[PDB]
């Protein structure tokens, strides 16, 4: 019947009679162009040394309301939107984002702002915010931002790095969660180098 059939399902279509036979498999986890799906990573707190002082800062702030949503709801405050790190690159700031996703039992997903803009019919600007839907069907998201700025590899060290368009757009999408769904399961993890790289609105 049609009860067992849904969107994005690999099936077998007969030839002579041109009819459905059976269902083969489902759709793979990676979608569209580039989709990074990592569930339950191997990074833990024991793998990160010397940052224990900073681990308590990413626990009671980031990790705490994710495991206990009834805390900020009872205190009358709002769940924090996102937390950004300030430090030199290559020091393992990305490792801290992958380690907290393991203890929270979430799916680590990056954001590459370079490939978010494509050209199709109706999908042209959809690819930018398409990562928002990927964090809807799966609540344990903890979105992480990649391709921040120029560390001295590419050119254009000044002006913008292209992240100001994606970062400020994803943070604005959080208002629909509390306004319509009345629940925010999405959190944006950001990072940078200096203080003045960010826009004054952030």
């Amino acid at each position: 019947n049609v009860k067992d059939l849904k969107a994005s399902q690999r099936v077998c279509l007969r030839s002579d009679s041109y009819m459905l036979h059976k269902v083969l498999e489902n759709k793979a986890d990676p979608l569209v162009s580039l989709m990074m799906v990592e569930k339950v990573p191997d990074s833990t707190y024991d793998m990160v040394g010397g940052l224990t002082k900073q681990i308590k800062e990413i626990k009671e702030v980031i990790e705490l309301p994710v495991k206990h949503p009834e805390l900020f709801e009872s205190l009358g405050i709002a769940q924090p939107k996102g937390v950004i790190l300030y430090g030199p690159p290559g020091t393992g700031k990305t490792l801290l984002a992958r380690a907290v996703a393991h203890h929270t039992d979430c799916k680590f997903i990056r954001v590459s702002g370079a490939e978010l803009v494509q050209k199709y019919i109706g999908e042209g600007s959809r690819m930018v915010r398409e990562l928002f839907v990927m964090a809807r069907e799966h609540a344990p998201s903890i979105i992480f931002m990649d391709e921040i700025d120029s560390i001295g590899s590419t050119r254009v060290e000044g002006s913008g790095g292209g992240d100001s368009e994606v970062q400020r757009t994803m943070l604005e999408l959080l208002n629909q969660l509390d306004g319509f769904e009345t629940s925010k399961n999405i959190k944006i993890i950001m990072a940078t180098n200096r203080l003045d790289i960010l826009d004054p609105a952030l």
């Binding site: 009819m19 205190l75 009358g76 050209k119 042209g124 915010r129 790095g161 400020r168 757009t169 609105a201």
Partner: protein, 363 residues
């Protein structure tokens, strides 16, 4: 008895004979394609996803009004004739569109802005809720409003309460997403924005935080300065040259609208210019009570005490202290937040969190 023989009997006989024809009409494969153009002779051309080309006759289960260039129809296997038109369900194109139904907001949380609310409510909510006022009088309501003021006044929550009371479609267009990498997609995006909003209901069009073209800042997206005009003038032609009776309401707001081209603002269509400033000590007392209404406060905490300490702060700076004070007590895990947490929270917001510049000062 008498009516059932002249109604139910001929109806059930025609339905059973119609289902027998559906086997010969609709085949097993039921190929589809893209409709290009239609002719008054009941003949059209359809292109399948394999890009073939055919010329057939228009059959039943469709009319001349349902056929539009660029749609998808149903074809036949051997004869390749058009069986009928296939409507498009589950949104027209994109499923992440900001369109929602009855969000959660009220007028109690936006309190204190009523001086600026009366202007936007009459030009947006009033014609949608009470259309008999503008229609019977003969005046035409404005096609949109624009907001300006200092950052932190909470201009986002002003239009958020409109979507709940109007109970209609509410759309949001980010000002930073207006441009596109590929040249020519800028106007193609803006054309589809007003196309969806024009088909279903007057609804709402809300644009916030426009950085577009302002002081560059995007070196990963190159328009060559020619895409600047084509993308911006597309929004201008839809607010002027596009034929509309006043249903579409387009709202634009950001930190500074003075850097934008005033021709793009299209004066005379927007009759409401609302300014926002920093609230005084009397308004902050009402705003502070809103964020602390759902918060558990101790007996020694006084609302009038924290307002006196606040100096040169906007509406967003007040909520920041209430959120930070909740996080300070969250580390100690206290049910009621004591007064020592508010003292340390109000100092850290105005220092590390909020950086107060000189700007125009001259003391």
């Amino acid at each position: 008895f008498v009516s059932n023989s002249e109604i139910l009997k001929p109806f059930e006989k025609k339905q059973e004979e119609e289902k027998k024809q559906l086997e010969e009409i609709r085949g097993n494969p039921l190929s589809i394609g893209t409709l290009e153009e239609i002719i008054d002779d009941d003949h059209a051309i359809v292109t399948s996803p394999t890009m073939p080309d055919y010329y057939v006759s228009i059959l039943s289960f469709v009319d001349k009004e349902l056929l539009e260039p660029g749609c998808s129809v149903l074809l036949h296997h051997k004869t390749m004739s058009i069986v009928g038109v296939l409507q498009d369900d589950a949104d027209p194109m994109v499923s992440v569109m900001k369109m929602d139904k009855s969000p959660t907001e009220s007028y109690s949380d936006i309190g204190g802005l009523e001086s600026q609310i009366q202007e936007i409510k009459e030009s947006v909510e009033l014609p949608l809720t009470h259309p008999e006022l503008y229609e019977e009088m003969g005046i035409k309501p404005p096609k949109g409003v624009i907001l300006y003021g200092a950052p932190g006044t909470g201009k986002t929550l002003l239009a958020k309460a409109v979507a709940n009371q109007t109970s209609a479609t509410f759309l949001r267009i980010v000002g930073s997403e207006l441009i596109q990498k590929y040249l020519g997609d800028g106007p193609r995006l803006c054309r589809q924005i007003f196309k969806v909003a024009g088909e279903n209901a007057p609804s709402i069009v809300f644009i916030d935080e426009i950085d577009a073209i302002g002081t560059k800042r995007y070196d990963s997206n190159s328009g060559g300065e020619r895409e600047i005009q084509r993308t911006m003038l597309e929004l201008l032609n839809q607010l002027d040259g596009f034929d509309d009776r006043g249903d579409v309401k387009v709202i634009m707001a950001t930190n500074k609208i003075e850097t934008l081209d005033p021709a793009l603002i299209r004066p005379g269509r927007i009759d409401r210019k609302i300014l926002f400033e920093n609230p005084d000590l009397s308004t902050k007392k009402k705003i502070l009570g809103i964020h602390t209404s759902k918060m558990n406060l101790s007996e020694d905490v006084n609302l009038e005490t924290l307002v006196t300490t606040k100096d040169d702060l906007s509406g967003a700076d007040i909520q920041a202290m209430c959120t930070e004070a909740g996080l300070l007590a969250l580390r100690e895990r206290r049910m009621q937040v004591t007064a020592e947490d508010f003292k340390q929270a109000k100092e850290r917001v105005m220092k590390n969190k909020v950086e107060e510049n000189l700007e125009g000062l001259y003391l």
